[PDB]
PDB file of C-alpha atoms and ligand atoms in Angstrom:
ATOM      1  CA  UNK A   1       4.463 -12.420  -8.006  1.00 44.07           C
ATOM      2  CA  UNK A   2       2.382  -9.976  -9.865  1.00 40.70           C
ATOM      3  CA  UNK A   3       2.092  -6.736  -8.588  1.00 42.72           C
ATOM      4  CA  UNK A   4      -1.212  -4.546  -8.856  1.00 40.91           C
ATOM      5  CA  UNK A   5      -1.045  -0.964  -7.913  1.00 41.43           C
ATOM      6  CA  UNK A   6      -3.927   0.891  -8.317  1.00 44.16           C
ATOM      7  CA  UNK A   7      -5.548   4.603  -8.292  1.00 46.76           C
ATOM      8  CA  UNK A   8      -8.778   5.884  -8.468  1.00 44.01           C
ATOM      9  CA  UNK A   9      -9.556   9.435  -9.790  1.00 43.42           C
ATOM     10  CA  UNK A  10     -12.365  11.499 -10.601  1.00 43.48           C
ATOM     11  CA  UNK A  11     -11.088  13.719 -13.941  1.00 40.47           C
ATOM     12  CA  UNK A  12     -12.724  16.182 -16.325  1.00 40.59           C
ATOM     13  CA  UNK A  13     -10.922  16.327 -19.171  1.00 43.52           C
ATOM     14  CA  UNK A  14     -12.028  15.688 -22.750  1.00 45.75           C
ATOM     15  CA  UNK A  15      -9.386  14.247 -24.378  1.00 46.56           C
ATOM     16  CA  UNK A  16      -5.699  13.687 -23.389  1.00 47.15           C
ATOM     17  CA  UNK A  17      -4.017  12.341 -20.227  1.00 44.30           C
ATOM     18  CA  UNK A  18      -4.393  14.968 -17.287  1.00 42.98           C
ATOM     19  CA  UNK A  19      -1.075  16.678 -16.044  1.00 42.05           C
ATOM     20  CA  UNK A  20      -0.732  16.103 -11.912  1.00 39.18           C
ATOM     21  CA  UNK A  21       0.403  14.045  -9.582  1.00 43.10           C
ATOM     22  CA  UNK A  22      -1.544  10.798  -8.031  1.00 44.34           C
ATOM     23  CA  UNK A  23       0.778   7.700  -6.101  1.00 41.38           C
ATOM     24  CA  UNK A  24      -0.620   4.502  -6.745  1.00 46.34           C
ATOM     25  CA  UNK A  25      -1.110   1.998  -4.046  1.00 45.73           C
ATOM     26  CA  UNK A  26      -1.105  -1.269  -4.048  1.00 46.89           C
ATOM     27  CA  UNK A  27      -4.322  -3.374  -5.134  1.00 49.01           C
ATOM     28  CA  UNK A  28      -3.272  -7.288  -4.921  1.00 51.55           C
ATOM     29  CA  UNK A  29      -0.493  -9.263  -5.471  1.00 51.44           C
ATOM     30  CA  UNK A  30      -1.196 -12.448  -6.895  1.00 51.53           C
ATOM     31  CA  UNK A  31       1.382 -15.724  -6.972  1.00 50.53           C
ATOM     32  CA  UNK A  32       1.030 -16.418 -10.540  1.00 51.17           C
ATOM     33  CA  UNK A  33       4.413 -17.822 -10.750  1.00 50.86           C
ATOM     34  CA  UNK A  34       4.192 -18.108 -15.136  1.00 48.31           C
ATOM     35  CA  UNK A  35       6.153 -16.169 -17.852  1.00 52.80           C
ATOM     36  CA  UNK A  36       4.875 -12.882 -19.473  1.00 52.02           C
ATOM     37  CA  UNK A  37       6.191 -11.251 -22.570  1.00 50.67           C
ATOM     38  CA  UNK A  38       2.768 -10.258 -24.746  1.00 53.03           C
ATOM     39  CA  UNK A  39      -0.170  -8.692 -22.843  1.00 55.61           C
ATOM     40  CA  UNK A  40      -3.525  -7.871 -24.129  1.00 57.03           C
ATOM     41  CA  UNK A  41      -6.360  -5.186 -23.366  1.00 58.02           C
ATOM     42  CA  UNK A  42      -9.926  -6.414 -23.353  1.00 59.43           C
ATOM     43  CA  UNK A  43     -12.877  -3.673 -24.407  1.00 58.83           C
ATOM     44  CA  UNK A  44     -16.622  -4.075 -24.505  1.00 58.45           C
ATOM     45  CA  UNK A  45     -18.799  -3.475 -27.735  1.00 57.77           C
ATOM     46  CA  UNK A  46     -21.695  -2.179 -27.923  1.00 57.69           C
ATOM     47  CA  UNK A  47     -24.689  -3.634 -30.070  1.00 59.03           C
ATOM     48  CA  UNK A  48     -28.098  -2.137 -30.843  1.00 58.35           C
TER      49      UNK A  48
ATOM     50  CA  UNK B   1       9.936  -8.908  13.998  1.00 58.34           C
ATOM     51  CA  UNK B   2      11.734  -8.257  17.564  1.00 57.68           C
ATOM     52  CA  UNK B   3      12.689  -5.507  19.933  1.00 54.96           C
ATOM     53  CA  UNK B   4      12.381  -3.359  22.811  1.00 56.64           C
ATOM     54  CA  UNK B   5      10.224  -0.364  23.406  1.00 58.25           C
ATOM     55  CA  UNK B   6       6.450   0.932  25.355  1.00 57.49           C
ATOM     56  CA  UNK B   7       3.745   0.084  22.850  1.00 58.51           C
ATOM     57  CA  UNK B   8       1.315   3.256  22.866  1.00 57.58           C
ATOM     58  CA  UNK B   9      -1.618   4.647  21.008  1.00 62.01           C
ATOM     59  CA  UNK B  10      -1.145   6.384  18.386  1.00 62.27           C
ATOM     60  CA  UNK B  11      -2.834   8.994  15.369  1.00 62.70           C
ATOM     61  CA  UNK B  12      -1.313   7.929  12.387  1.00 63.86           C
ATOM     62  CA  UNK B  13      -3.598   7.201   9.567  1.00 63.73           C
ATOM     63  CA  UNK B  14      -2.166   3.858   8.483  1.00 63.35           C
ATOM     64  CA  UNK B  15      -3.077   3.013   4.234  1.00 60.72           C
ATOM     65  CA  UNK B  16      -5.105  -0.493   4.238  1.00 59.15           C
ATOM     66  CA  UNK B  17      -2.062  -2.011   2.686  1.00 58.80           C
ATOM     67  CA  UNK B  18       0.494  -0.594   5.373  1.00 56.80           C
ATOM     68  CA  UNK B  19       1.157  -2.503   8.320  1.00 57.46           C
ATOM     69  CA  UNK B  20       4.359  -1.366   9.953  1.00 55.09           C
ATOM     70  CA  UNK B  21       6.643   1.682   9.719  1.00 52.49           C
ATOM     71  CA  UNK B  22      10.492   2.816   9.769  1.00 52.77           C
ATOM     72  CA  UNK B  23      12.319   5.575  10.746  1.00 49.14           C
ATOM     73  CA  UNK B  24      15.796   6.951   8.841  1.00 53.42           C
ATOM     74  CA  UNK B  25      17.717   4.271  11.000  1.00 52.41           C
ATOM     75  CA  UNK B  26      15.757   1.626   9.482  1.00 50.05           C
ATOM     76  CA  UNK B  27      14.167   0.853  12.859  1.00 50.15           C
ATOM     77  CA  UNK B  28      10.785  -0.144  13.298  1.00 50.76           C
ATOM     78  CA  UNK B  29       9.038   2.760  14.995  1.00 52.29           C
ATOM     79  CA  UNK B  30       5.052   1.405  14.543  1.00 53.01           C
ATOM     80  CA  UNK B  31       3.420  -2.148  14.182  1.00 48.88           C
ATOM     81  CA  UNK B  32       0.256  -3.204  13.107  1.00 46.34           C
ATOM     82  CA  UNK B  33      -1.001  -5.849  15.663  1.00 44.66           C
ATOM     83  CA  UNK B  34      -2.313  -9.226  13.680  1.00 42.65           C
ATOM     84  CA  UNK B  35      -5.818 -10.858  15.143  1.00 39.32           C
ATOM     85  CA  UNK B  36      -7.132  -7.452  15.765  1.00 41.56           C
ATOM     86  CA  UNK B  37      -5.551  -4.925  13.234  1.00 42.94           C
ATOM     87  CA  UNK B  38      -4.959  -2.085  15.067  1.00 43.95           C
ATOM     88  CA  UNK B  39      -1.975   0.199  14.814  1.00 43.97           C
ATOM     89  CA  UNK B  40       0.391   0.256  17.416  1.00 43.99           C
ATOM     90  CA  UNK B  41       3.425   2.560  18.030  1.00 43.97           C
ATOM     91  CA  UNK B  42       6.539   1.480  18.946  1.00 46.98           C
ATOM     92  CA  UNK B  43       8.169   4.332  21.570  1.00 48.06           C
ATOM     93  CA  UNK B  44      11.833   3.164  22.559  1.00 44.74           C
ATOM     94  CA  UNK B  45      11.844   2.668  26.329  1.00 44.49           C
ATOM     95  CA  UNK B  46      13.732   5.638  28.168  1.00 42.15           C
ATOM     96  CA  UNK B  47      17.105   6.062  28.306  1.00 41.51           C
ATOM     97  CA  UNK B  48      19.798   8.998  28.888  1.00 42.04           C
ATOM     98  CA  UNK B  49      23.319   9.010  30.805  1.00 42.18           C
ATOM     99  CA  UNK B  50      24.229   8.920  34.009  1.00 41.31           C
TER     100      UNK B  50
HETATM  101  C1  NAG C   1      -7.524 -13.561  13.009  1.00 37.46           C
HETATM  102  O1  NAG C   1      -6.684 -12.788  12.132  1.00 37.46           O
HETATM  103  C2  NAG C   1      -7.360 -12.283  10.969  1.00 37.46           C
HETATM  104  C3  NAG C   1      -6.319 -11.580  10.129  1.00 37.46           C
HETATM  105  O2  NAG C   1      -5.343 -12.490   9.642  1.00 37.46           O
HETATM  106  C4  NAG C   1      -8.514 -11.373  11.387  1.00 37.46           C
HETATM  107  O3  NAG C   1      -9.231 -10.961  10.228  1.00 37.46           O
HETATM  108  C5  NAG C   1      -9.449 -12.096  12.351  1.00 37.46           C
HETATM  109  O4  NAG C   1     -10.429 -11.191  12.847  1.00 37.46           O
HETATM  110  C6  NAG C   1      -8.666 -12.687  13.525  1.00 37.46           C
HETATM  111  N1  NAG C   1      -9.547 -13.443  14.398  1.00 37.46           N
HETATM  112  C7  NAG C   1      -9.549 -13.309  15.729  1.00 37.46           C
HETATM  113  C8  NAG C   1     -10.524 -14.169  16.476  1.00 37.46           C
HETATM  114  O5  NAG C   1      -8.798 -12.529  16.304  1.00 37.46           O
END
């Protein structure tokens, strides 16, 4: 089972990771049922 | 999930994802009804000695 928890929150700050307090709850869990050791992010470009 | 109690409206604002609830005993103390998703309290039926 993977677990998704999730939190939503509308920040301010320019440039480093805001110091408070915010519980995540629980998105989805999905029944994946495969091995995991390497994960990747994805990112957008932008062309002009 | 069994058990005894009156089943009784209650004001506790439930998360999406939470459906029941527990008390320090582990008992369950409120339910959330399938088919029709409301939240229901679970008030142990009254009791005291004699
Ligand atoms: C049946 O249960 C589902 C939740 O599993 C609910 O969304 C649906 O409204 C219920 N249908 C009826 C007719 O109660």
């Amino acid at each position: 089972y993977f677990k998704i928890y999730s939190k939503h929150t509308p920040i301010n700050l320019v440039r480093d990771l805001p110091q408070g307090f915010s519980a995540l709850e629980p998105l989805v869990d999905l029944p994946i049922g495969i091995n995991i050791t390497r994960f990747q992010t994805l990112l957008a470009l932008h062309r002009s | 999930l069994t058990g005894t109690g009156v089943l009784t409206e209650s004001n506790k604002k439930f998360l999406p994802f939470q459906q029941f609830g527990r008390d320090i005993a582990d008992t369950t103390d409120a339910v959330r009804d399938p088919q029709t998703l409301e939240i229901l309290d679970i008030t142990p039926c009254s009791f005291g000695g004699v």
